Design a protein around this motif. Structure first.
Motif, PDB file in Angstrom:
ATOM      1  N   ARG A   1      20.788   6.505  26.468  1.00  0.00           N
ATOM      2  CA  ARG A   1      21.204   5.504  27.281  1.00  0.00           C
ATOM      3  C   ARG A   1      20.242   4.844  28.383  1.00  0.00           C
ATOM      4  NH1 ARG A   1      25.872   8.576  27.427  1.00  0.00           N
ATOM      5  NH2 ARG A   1      25.465   9.217  29.552  1.00  0.00           N
ATOM      6  N   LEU A   2      19.380   5.846  28.809  1.00  0.00           N
ATOM      7  CA  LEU A   2      18.664   5.680  29.807  1.00  0.00           C
ATOM      8  C   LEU A   2      17.221   4.766  29.249  1.00  0.00           C
ATOM      9  CD1 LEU A   2      17.451   5.750  32.856  1.00  0.00           C
ATOM     10  CD2 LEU A   2      16.636   8.142  31.982  1.00  0.00           C
ATOM     11  N   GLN A   3      17.120   5.159  27.980  1.00  0.00           N
ATOM     12  CA  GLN A   3      15.880   4.388  27.418  1.00  0.00           C
ATOM     13  C   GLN A   3      16.480   3.150  26.972  1.00  0.00           C
ATOM     14  OE1 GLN A   3      12.794   5.566  26.362  1.00  0.00           O
ATOM     15  NE2 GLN A   3      12.561   3.511  25.739  1.00  0.00           N
ATOM     16  N   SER A   4      17.691   2.752  26.293  1.00  0.00           N
ATOM     17  CA  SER A   4      18.349   1.695  26.239  1.00  0.00           C
ATOM     18  C   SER A   4      18.254   0.737  27.348  1.00  0.00           C
ATOM     19  CB  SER A   4      19.791   1.933  25.661  1.00  0.00           C
ATOM     20  OG  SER A   4      20.545   0.564  25.480  1.00  0.00           O
ATOM     21  N   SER A   5      18.523   1.172  28.541  1.00  0.00           N
ATOM     22  CA  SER A   5      18.644   0.374  29.640  1.00  0.00           C
ATOM     23  C   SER A   5      17.362  -0.171  30.105  1.00  0.00           C
ATOM     24  CB  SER A   5      19.334   1.101  30.745  1.00  0.00           C
ATOM     25  OG  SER A   5      18.257   2.091  31.466  1.00  0.00           O
ATOM     26  N   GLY A   6      16.098   0.533  29.460  1.00  0.00           N
ATOM     27  CA  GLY A   6      14.993  -0.443  29.715  1.00  0.00           C
ATOM     28  C   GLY A   6      14.123   0.623  30.439  1.00  0.00           C
ATOM     29  N   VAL A   7      14.179   1.724  30.352  1.00  0.00           N
ATOM     30  CA  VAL A   7      13.475   2.698  30.992  1.00  0.00           C
ATOM     31  C   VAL A   7      12.656   3.642  30.107  1.00  0.00           C
ATOM     32  CG1 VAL A   7      13.380   4.834  32.595  1.00  0.00           C
ATOM     33  CG2 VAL A   7      14.915   3.003  33.141  1.00  0.00           C
ATOM     34  N   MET A   8      11.465   3.641  30.257  1.00  0.00           N
ATOM     35  CA  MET A   8      10.326   4.702  29.399  1.00  0.00           C
ATOM     36  C   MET A   8      10.736   6.163  29.706  1.00  0.00           C
ATOM     37  SD  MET A   8       7.687   6.824  28.417  1.00  0.00           S
ATOM     38  CE  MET A   8       6.865   7.064  27.002  1.00  0.00           C
TER      39      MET A   8
END
Ligand SMILES: [Ca+2]
Ligand SMILES: [Ca+2]
Length: 279
Positions: A147-154
């Protein structure tokens, strides 16, 4: 820019060969990017952070890093002397207690926090999260990292220190994030480093000098130390406009030193993070 007599890990990520001592990097140095260090906290007052670090969330009684681990990892991301991205903004999220332990529920909340909190922050060159933590396989922990990746965070996460296949560890085994193994200064896989198909990249992880609590410094080892090298590299490359949060792990793999490492099991990438800086 050039930092002479740099920690070997910084020199290594700016060289095609082991054994050098100068860290070569573009002077932009991750300016305009933001890296969340999800860990035991950050001693923001450390002179090495130059006012660029702040705590933004704690899941314990205090926001203080009473351990040192988070401060060390944050230092490798972005301290003046020990950091890959020396001008990035650092945000501390304390999901681990002062013994370096934390419940999966808390670690998940911390990831969910960063996905939202980034929308309250000015990070024009993008957002990175460094997770030098993990335990046994958990689909819930993996999903939180996804989710964290999907939200736009590397998202960069540690492969783990079990000298085993990272498939059995989380968030290491989440495919969609950047799973980081550890190497030593002679380009060997670190003795403790996990391996396996899910690893994306290796970073320096054995005998890594960085910041510590009480305004100090020390050298320690782990995939926890390799992970912030890759997180900082991502921030640095994002500031340069070479890649994005969604694509940086792949970009770092594309541009890595290939085949330099020893004791890499068949089926594990032989890729070592490299900034390809050309003055
Ligand atoms: Ca080489
Ligand atoms: Ca991956």
């Amino acid at each position: 820019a050039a930092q002479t007599n740099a920690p070997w890990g910084l020199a290594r990520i700016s060289s095609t060969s082991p054994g050098t001592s100068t860290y070569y990097y573009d002077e932009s140095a991750g300016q305009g990017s933001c890296v969340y260090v999800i860990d035991t906290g950050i001693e923001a007052s450390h002179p090495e952070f130059e006012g660029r670090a702040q705590m933004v969330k704690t899941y314990y009684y205090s926001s203080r890093d009473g351990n040192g681990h988070g401060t060390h990892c944050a230092g490798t991301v972005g301290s003046r002397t020990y950091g890959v991205a020396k001008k990035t903004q650092l945000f501390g999220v304390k999901v681990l207690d002062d013994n370096g332990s934390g419940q999966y529920s808390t670690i998940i909340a911390g990831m969910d926090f960063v996905a939202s909190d980034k929308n309250n922050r000015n990070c024009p060159k993008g957002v990175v999260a460094s997770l030098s933590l993990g335990g046994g396989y958990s689909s819930s922990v993996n999903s939180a990292a996804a989710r964290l990746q999907s939200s736009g965070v590397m998202v960069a996460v540690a492969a783990g220190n079990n000298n085993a296949d990272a498939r059995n560890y989380s968030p290491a085994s989440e495919p969609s994030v950047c799973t980081v193994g550890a190497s030593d200064r002679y380009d060997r896989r670190s003795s403790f480093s996990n391996y396996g198909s899910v690893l994306d990249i290796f970073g320096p992880g054995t005998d890594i000098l960085s910041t510590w609590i009480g305004g100090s410094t020390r050298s320690i080892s782990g995939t926890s130390m390799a992970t912030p090298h890759v997180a900082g590299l991502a921030a640095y490359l994002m500031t340069l406009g070479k890649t994005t949060a969604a694509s940086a792990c792949r970009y770092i793999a594309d541009t890595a030193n290939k085949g330099d490492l020893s004791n890499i099991p068949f089926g594990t990438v032989n890729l070592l993070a490299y900034n390809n800086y050309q003055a």
